[PDB]
């Protein structure tokens, strides 16, 4: 709402990780975390 800055606090993805076989990390970037309301403006389609 206010004094926002769109900063990340919570990282509840997993508890632990062991016996890793693959690792990859992209280059540093800045994601647009600006939370807006209304209609949908972006469509990111994926297939796996």
């Amino acid at each position: 709402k206010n004094n926002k800055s769109w900063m990340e606090s919570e990282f509840r993805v997993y508890s632990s990780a062991n016996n890793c076989t693959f690792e990859y990390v992209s280059q540093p970037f800045l994601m647009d975390l600006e939370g807006k309301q209304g209609n949908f403006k972006n469509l990111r389609e994926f297939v796996f």
């Binding site: 890793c20 076989t21 693959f22 690792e23 990859y24």
Partner: protein, 48 residues
């Protein structure tokens, strides 16, 4: 691993997991910087 700072013990060896990469092994065979080079079951030129 070959040029590591220090090696581990014979009973708690530092097992480095290697995955998703490439490496030249013929240069290691002809590096002239190793004392023992004994491959069992596969030649250094075949595994390339």
């Amino acid at each position: 691993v070959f040029n590591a700072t220090r090696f581990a013990s014979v009973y708690a060896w530092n097992r480095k997991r290697i995955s998703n990469c490439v490496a030249d092994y013929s240069v290691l065979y002809n590096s002239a910087s190793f004392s023992t080079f004994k491959c069992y079951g596969v030649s250094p030129t075949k595994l390339n």
